From a paper:
The crystal structure of hCE revealed the typical five-stranded antiparallel β-sheet wrapped around a central α-helix. Two disulfide bridges additionally stabilize the structure by clamping strands β4 and β5 and the hCE-specific appending structure that is inserted between strands β3 and β4. We compared the affinity of glycosylated hCE and non-glycosylated (E. coli produced) hCE towards cathepsin B and found that the affinity of cathepsin B towards glyco-hCE (IC50=5.7±1.3 nm) is two times higher than towards E. coli hCE (IC50=9.3±2.4 nm).
Numbering used by the authors: 8 to 124
Write the structure that this text describes.
């Protein structure tokens, strides 16, 4: 078995960004809201070395005006989805654990825990 150091990374790190996008996309596939949520801010980002790499992300999200009825996943561009304003506006502070392995393309959201703000 292989277990490594838990290290702090920059939120702007390009591989942290991909992990975040995989974390958000997985949340939307399993969330109860009609609207797609979107990452607004990445607060903290750590990485741990395993047979692969685990990414421990603390990040803020926001509900959008984009709906699952009108737009399907895998074909949704969250950059074209505006944050909902008033009445619907819902914010979440989420902890994400993203596993990335070399033999796979799709990263996995292994665990999550969101908390309204």
């Amino acid at each position: 078995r292989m277990v490594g150091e838990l290290r702090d990374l920059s939120p702007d790190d390009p591989q942290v960004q991909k992990a975040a996008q995989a974390a958000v996309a997985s949340y939307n596939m399993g969330s109860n809201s009609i609207y797609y949520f979107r990452d607004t801010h990445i607060i903290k980002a750590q990485s741990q070395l395993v047979a692969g790499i685990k990414y421990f992300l603390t990040m803020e999200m926001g509900s959008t005006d984009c709906r699952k009825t009108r737009v399907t996943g895998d074909h949704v561009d969250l950059t074209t989805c505006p944050l909902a304003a008033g009445a619907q506006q819902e914010k979440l502070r989420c902890d994400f654990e993203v596993l990335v392995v070399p033999w796979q393309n799709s990263s996995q959201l292994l665990k999550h825990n969101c908390v309204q703000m």
